[PDB]
Amino acid sequence: MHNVLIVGASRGIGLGLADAFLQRGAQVFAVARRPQGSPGLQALAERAGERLQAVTGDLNQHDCAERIGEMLGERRIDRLIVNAGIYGPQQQDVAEIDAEQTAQLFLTNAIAPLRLARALSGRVSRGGVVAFMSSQMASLALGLSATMPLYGASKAALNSLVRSWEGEFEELPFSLLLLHPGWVRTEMSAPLSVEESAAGLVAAVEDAAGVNACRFVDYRNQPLPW
């Protein structure tokens, strides 16, 4: 059975990804700060039974990889999706951001996702896929982030760290994906649904399985420029 780990699965796109992988017959491990308070996860569990396993965890805690390891046991991870993202300060103003907000923005969106992926990487199947929720706002060539510079810069830093990780290998043992989910209703009147976005992202993730490449793609599996 395909083991899929979705970090940040309580609602929105994270939940949608769990639902979409379950519909494909995967065993899904869904991590959230408070699994039990998620009506979406509770409804998935009632439908999927033991094939959906909830993990209490937070990417920003030091023990998160170990808590995940306890739930996985000997199981290898075929697909690892880190779905983390905060906006940062609402003002998105370099003149105002303080040390605590800076630390929180770059730890949450860039450093902690790599930290967790790396910690678990030894359990990832050869020819598997490790994917990070990124953003079109990370793209320097598209340069679309003027109204949210801090968020975009945090996601550029994520993409940078991931590319640097790639550089440590002679040959990648799994694919490394940076994903743009689209402008998703309930995430960031938006018509693009969680279901459509999640279906698209799952297809993109599956398309990278066995390729062992680093790609920056959207929910249509179209490449984004760096």
Place this chain on the structure above:
Amino acid sequence: MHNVLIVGASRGIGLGLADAFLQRGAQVFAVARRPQGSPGLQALAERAGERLQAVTGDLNQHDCAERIGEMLGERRIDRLIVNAGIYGPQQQDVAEIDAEQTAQLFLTNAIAPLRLARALSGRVSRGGVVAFMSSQMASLALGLSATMPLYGASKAALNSLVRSWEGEFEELPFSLLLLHPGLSVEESAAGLVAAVEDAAGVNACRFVDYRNQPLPW
């Protein structure tokens, strides 16, 4: 006369840039945390006299723009170079970097440089040049930063913030340069000066090295 402001001019490439612009006849305003403790700045001042003005200021403190304003007065800045950069933790390990180190790394290398440039931007000459010391390690396409991922990521964030700032304008009133310095200080500075001058009047965002060769994002 060209007014050139170099933020972070106490030593190394910052100092070299001050020297190189002075040799071209510019009026140079050189900012350092402790100008008086810099033998390099002190020797430049003795040689250039009033053409070098030293400014006490720290990019990481919120009073830096005001200290600069006191030296500049009403004069417009033709060239603004922000020379900042720390390595971050020696381990360069995402498993080890804590909140205080993260804040320090991204404030120093990305946020504070933009913050200062923005604060001063209204004084920059139309068709002038605002430049940031970046790194080839910032480039995602070159992907060179495996041994220093935190440093690289901090400079990618700098490049991102600068590109975003570009996007706030109807039209750029000055060029925005991200510079990779490279291997002597003198050669690097001579090259960067030529690159900065080449962008005057262009009003573009460019990521270039000491040879003025474009680097991919």
